[model samples]
Target: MEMFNVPELIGAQAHAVNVILDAETAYPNLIFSDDLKSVRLGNKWERLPDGPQRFDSCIIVLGSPSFLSGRRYWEVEVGDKTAWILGACKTSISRKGNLTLSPENGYWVVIMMKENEYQASSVPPTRLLIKEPPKRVGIFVDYRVGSISFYNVTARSHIYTFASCSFSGPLQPIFSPGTRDGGKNTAPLTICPVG
Candidate 1:
């Protein structure tokens, strides 16, 4: 019960959602492809309005069909890139300044900081060492039970999980293309269609 197939997370398959990147919530330096299925870091910061919905300090974005309550699952294709973050955050997450990026701050996320180093977001992120890094990650969340899990689709292995979460509002999926690495990390984080 702890592990499941990449495309068959729900067991019941009741709530797998096809997530699209929220274009309006993107940070200026991150560019979402026209179709909204992928996002990548750009070389320069863009000039955009300081809207409350936009992420200003961090290179992150939020996506919807915000789940108020459900056992939902979604997958993101990370390709062979070096860095990225995947998870879900409360719809009320702040969009303007530096963020702590932990469950305490309403962010339940797992990240590949660089190379194959991975972690679950925290004060000093929990280090996760899986032999090989995942090219695609599947995120599953159960609202009523208050839990989150991350799977390495390429390996069909469980990467990590938040045994418990504090969900008080609608949950919006979040994607962070990580920071720019002098243009070293160029691959986009693509949202995989979940049937």
Candidate 2:
């Protein structure tokens, strides 16, 4: 698939999408809520009685029902947090080490680094123009066409699109709330069910 601008996408509609947090794919350093609906970087070293552990730089979790071919739409509740990343990643992506979230690296995502700083993880990294950061993000994936579109569910507007993605096998919805910013960005990135 060849990448293109967001305007080329139209006729996109919402689907009753619900993505569950895949506990099996979650990194060991991440702590999942009891229901597996939310995930945040663990503050074990600071809170746990155990001694300081090797801090994991980047933690990732994939959604259930990894998709091979379908048009799926789902939203993630990323409440006021400084940094987070969410989108689709190739099933073969390395979930073990420091992740390079780029299309060429088998991950296509919309990343929020800080207030008013959003980006699409393309080769050169495209800057996003979002006046206000969205509290809830909507993701639309067209597996058949190899494209993923992101929307600001809170603001009800389009954010960015990763078009023409090449899928070798299946793709999973990946999420990362980023490393705990000294407890500043500890909020979990939740999978918002579409009602």
Give Cα distance to truth, residue 161, candidate 1, Å: 0.8
Off by over 4 Å in 2: 1-13, 46-57
TM-score of each: 0.89, 0.85
Model 2's lDDT to the true fold?
0.76
Off by over 4 Å in 1: 1-14, 45-52
Q: Can you write out model 1's per-residue Cα lDDT over 87-110, one digit (the tens) per residue?
A: 999998888888889898899999
Question: How far is 59's C-alpha from truth in model 1 (Å)?
Answer: 0.3
For every candidate structure, what is the RMSD over all alpha carbons to the true structure, in angstroms? 2.9, 4.2
Task: Give the 10-residue window scoring lowest on summed lDDT in candidate 1.
Answer: 3-12
User: Candidate 2's error at 75, in angstroms?
Assistant: 0.6
Candidate lDDT scores, in order, read: 0.80, 0.76
